[PDB]
Design a protein around this ligand. Structure first.
Ligand SMILES: CC(C)c1ccc([C@@H]2NC(=O)c3cccnc3N2)cc1
Ligand SMILES: [Zn+2]
Length: 208
């Protein structure tokens, strides 16, 4: 049921999404081990992901959450990188897309920082890198990220140095307490609380 619609680079929708992508690159404590060494991306394509059934599933859940949290779904747009991006855009998020050993338990992880999601495009810790060159810092192979609509509801705040939501909460907010320049990461425990709205195809760029 999924169809992908190409946005034109001249479209302001493309531009606002590219700007979120580029502006949220940061340095990582691994020096680029997992995701590569870059300060910016070459964006190749931005597609809108259209799936009626996955959208209605998302909105039905969003309304329930909102009703449990003073009419506030606490909806964000957040990045997600995963080797399962093609399954996600066709079938939706589910338990198979959870990070079982994640620091906030077994849920689905999202990032404010695009470069943080980029670390997971080829697997946990970057896996073995790009399929073609086995290079976690490949400047040639095309990567994909999702920019997702995510319902957080009442989010448990965990300051930081498929399972269930903590009782009374709809998600977890991992807030970096040590690196004051890292943005938050978020965990949801039901796939119905995220819709994979934009599929972004890109390359990381070698610093000049
Ligand atoms: C299911 C496995 C392979 C998996 C997929 C995706 C991630 C995940 N992707 C993110 O974009 C992300 C963002 C912030 C923190 N952790 C993340 N991991 C973790 C584990
Ligand atoms: Zn490659």
């Amino acid at each position: 049921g999924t169809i992908l619609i190409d946005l034109s680079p001249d479209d302001k929708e493309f531009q606002s999404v590219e700007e979120e992508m580029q502006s949220t690159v940061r340095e990582h404590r691994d020096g680029g081990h997992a995701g590569g060494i870059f300060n910016r991306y070459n964006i190749l394509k931005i597609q809108k992901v259209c799936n009626k059934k996955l959208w209605e599933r998302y909105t039905h859940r969003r309304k329930e959450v909102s009703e449990e949290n003073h009419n506030h779904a606490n909806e964000r747009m957040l990045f997600h990188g995963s080797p399962f991006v093609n399954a996600i855009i066709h079938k939706g998020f589910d338990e198979r897309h959870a990070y079982i050993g994640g620091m906030f338990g077994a849920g689905i992880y999202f990032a404010e920082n695009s470069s943080k999601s980029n670390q997971y495009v080829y697997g946990i810790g970057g896996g073995t890198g790009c399929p073609v060159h086995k290079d976690r810092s490949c400047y040639i192979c095309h990567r994909q990220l999702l920019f997702c609509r995510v319902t957080l509801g009442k989010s448990f705040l965990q300051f930081s140095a498929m399972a269930h939501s903590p009782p009374g909460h709809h998600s977890v907010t991992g807030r970096p307490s040590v690196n004051g320049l890292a943005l938050a990461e978020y965990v949801i425990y039901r796939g119905e609380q995220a819709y994979p709205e934009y599929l972004i195809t890109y390359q990381i760029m070698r610093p000049e």
